Amino acid sequence: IQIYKYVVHNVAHRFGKTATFMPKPMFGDNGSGMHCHMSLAKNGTNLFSGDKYAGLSEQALYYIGGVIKHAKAINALANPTTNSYKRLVPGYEAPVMLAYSARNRSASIRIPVVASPKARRIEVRFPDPAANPYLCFAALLMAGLDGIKNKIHPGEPMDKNLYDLPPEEAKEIPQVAGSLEEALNALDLDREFLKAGGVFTDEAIDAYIALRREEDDRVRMTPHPVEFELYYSV
Amino acid sequence: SAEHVLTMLNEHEVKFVDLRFTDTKGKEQHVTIPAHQVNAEFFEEGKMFDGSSIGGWKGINESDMVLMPDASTAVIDPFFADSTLIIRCDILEPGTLQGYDRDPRSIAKRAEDYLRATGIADTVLFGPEPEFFLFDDIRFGASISGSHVAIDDIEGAWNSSTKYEGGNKGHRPGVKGGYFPVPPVDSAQDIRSEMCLVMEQMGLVVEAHHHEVATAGQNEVATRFNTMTKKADE
Ligand SMILES: Nc1ncnc2c1ncn2[C@@H]1O[C@H](COP(=O)(O)OP(=O)(O)O)[C@@H](O)[C@H]1O
Ligand SMILES: [Mn+2]
Ligand SMILES: [Mn+2]
Ligand SMILES: [Tl+]
């Protein structure tokens, strides 16, 4: 991913362009995401193929359960910018609902409908390119493993249709963090799954939270152009 | 009427008389006659034209029609530099003096007559609420190579970003928001009231005035109802 970004940035430059991996440079058009397809393996066998939903193993479902349980904390790493939250906005295509499905696009976890069991996996759609690939990937894993170690059932799939299928029970389906401040909060509290195996240390986590917290401050403290459109004649 | 009109000529030292009427499309037309051309004769048989020159009234052969001054409509023009009295006219066919089939005013009068003739009622009451826009600049055109229209006004929400030579003052109605903000957001209070004072000096009765919903100067002056034909005059 780092080599990828390097080539993109530099080939663009070499052609008289400028490339950006920002999640949402423009309001009104598509943002840039970084869907993450994942699967586990042992001795060349795909531990995610099974008899359960869409060809999934039960191991895959627990992995999902873990990701859904720790989603908001994972957000602090997969969507590390305030800009990230302008992409993860109640759109219809916007992958903000913490549920899994093979078809539904409101679902932040798509299950690739595929032929060969060798290629069975899950696609966590909410990450964006601003994410530190290492910390984001690791966090996704650690969450999935905590889902497996603790057999966290991901509940039932959401094949029906998105919240634009508004309040049916208010549609109180779990969602991703709605802001960076919130993702940072989640990561603060929900940190144990990361500290497992001494992978993430408290200082490592607190250091990260602090860096991002000062970035969040700049955005929260600086008057926004739109605030003038909305409030200058107040 | 005739008797009264000769009075107004001296009371206001009128130098000209502006003969007005409406074409098929609904646009008020006019021709000016010196005050000294007004006499006994003029009121009983009017003055005629080289009419073959108007639209939807154009008959290749029979081009001549009669302008019949309606003495009840006499009113001073508040804009012209030289004292001039406006007199609305009816277009009548020569000799017969009956009232042109294509004359919109004659048509409205016939419809008022017909109401009475059927005995269903004796008077028709009309109260239109016509709305309008006030701009600063309007440009448009169409030729073989293209077409265009460009609207511009100090209130246009799009000007929130415009550089003005004494500075952009910035209080303007947003899209669909020009409704009732008080000045300086509403830049037309003085303009509307002038329109009201003048309308009243011309025989109309004003009920209210206010800015309308659209940005870029939508406004409205509500006038009191009146009998059908008189209202269309108004
Ligand atoms: N028969 C009637 N009796 C009373 N008022 C009438 C009658 N027929 C028509 N009207 C007219 O209704 C019109 C006004 O409407 P208004 O709601 O004040 O306009 P706007 O809300 O669009 O600014 C007036 O011109 C009023 O005098
Ligand atoms: Mn994808
Ligand atoms: Mn109105
Ligand atoms: Tl995208």
For every residue of B5-35, DSSP letters joined together read HHHHHHHTT--EEEEEEE-TTS-EEEEEEEG
A234 touches chain B (CB under 8 A): no
- Which residues neighbour A54 within 8 Å (Cβ) at sequence distance 6 or greater? A102, A111, A113
What is the position in ligand 1's atom list of the atom closest to the CA of B125? 8
H or E element at residue A99: strand A97-101
Residue B64: CB partners within 8 Å, gap ≥ 6?
Answer: B48, B49, B50, B51, B52, B94
Structure-token pair, residue B227? 């009998």
CA distances in angstroms from B23 to B101, B192, B200, listed in the order given: 12, 27, 25
**Experimental structure resolution, Å:** 2.7
Q: How many angstroms separate the alpha carbon of residue B102 from the centre of ligand 1?
A: 30
How many angstroms separate the CA atoms of B130 and B141, rounded? 27
Judged by its nearest atom, the ligand closest to the C-alpha of residue A94 is: 4
Q: Is the Cβ–Cβ distance between B124 and B225 less than 8 Å? A: no
Q: What is the CATH number of the domain that holds B14?
A: 3.10.20.70
The reply to whether A198 sits in an annotated binding site is: no
Q: Which two tokens stand for residue A160?
A: 């029906």
> Which one-letter DSSP state was computed for residue A53?
G
Q: Is A55 left (phi over 0), alpha (psi -120 to 50) or beta?
A: left
Which residue has its alpha carbon closest to ligand 1 atom 12?
Answer: B127
Pairing label, strands A45-46, B28-34: unpaired
On whether B131 is known to bind a ligand per the annotation, the reply is yes
Instruction: Show Cβ contacts of residue B123 under 8 Å, excluding neighbours closer than 6 positions.
Output: B112, B115, B227
Cα distances (Å, whole numbers) of residue B150 to A63, A96, A215, B146, B158: 58, 42, 42, 14, 12
Phi then psi for residue B52, to 5 deg, are -35, -5
**What gap in Å lies between CA A167 and CA A145, rounded to an integer?**
33
CA of residue A138 relative to chain centroid, distance: 12
Q: Is the CB of B207 under 6 A from ligand 1?
A: yes
Instruction: Measure the CA–CA gap between B47 and B40, rounded to whole angstroms.
Output: 12
B131 lines ligand 1 (CB under 6 A): no
Gyration radius of chain A over CA positions: 19
Please report the residues numbered 178 through 197 in chain B whose beta carbons come closer than 8 angstroms to any beta carbon of chain A. Answer: 181, 185
Compute φ and ψ for A77, nearest 5 degrees: -110, -35
* CA trace torsion B225, B229, B230, B234 (10° rounding): 80
Per-residue exposure over A169-202, b if at least 16 CB sit within 10 Å of its own CB, e if not: eeeebebbbebbbebbbbbeebbebbeeeeebee
User: Bridge partners of A41?
Assistant: A46
Contact B171 A232 (CB under 8 A): yes
E runs forming strands in B93-205: 125-126, 131-133, 137-143, 146-152
**Distance separating alpha carbons of residues B127 and B110, to the nearest angstrom:** 19
Nearest Cα neighbor of B16 from B32, B4, B31, B5 is B32
Instruction: Tell how far the Cα of B219 is from the centroid of ligand 1, in angstroms.
Output: 17
What are the boundaries of each domain within chain A? 1-222
In Å, the largest CA–CA distance within chain A is 67
Angle (nearest 5°) at CA A19 between A17 and A20: 150
For A211, phi then psi, to 5°, come to -60, -50
Q: Tell me the two tokens of residue A150.
A: 């603790």
Solving technique: X-ray
Identify the DSSP state of A224: P
Q: What secondary structure, in 3-state letters, does B53-98 show?
A: HCCCCCCCCCCCCEEEECHHHCEECCCCCCCEEEEEEEEECCCCCC
Query: Which stretches of A102-189 are assigned E, i.e. beta strand?
Result: 107-110, 122-124
- As a whole number of angstroms, the distance between CA B157 and CA B168 comes to 12
Which residues have CB under 8 Å from B188's CB, separation 6+? B134, B211, B217, B219
Ligand 2 center to A36 CA (angstroms): 8
Residue pair A103/A12 in contact (Cβ under 8 Å)? The answer is no
Q: How many CA atoms lie within 13 A of B116 on its CB side?
A: 9
The SS3 call for residue A78 is helix
Which domain covers residue B76, as residue numbers?
A: 1-103
Token reading at A153: 């059932």
CATH topology assigned to domain A1-222: Creatine Kinase; Chain A, domain 2 (3.30.590)
Q: How many CB atoms lie within 10 A of CB A43?
A: 5
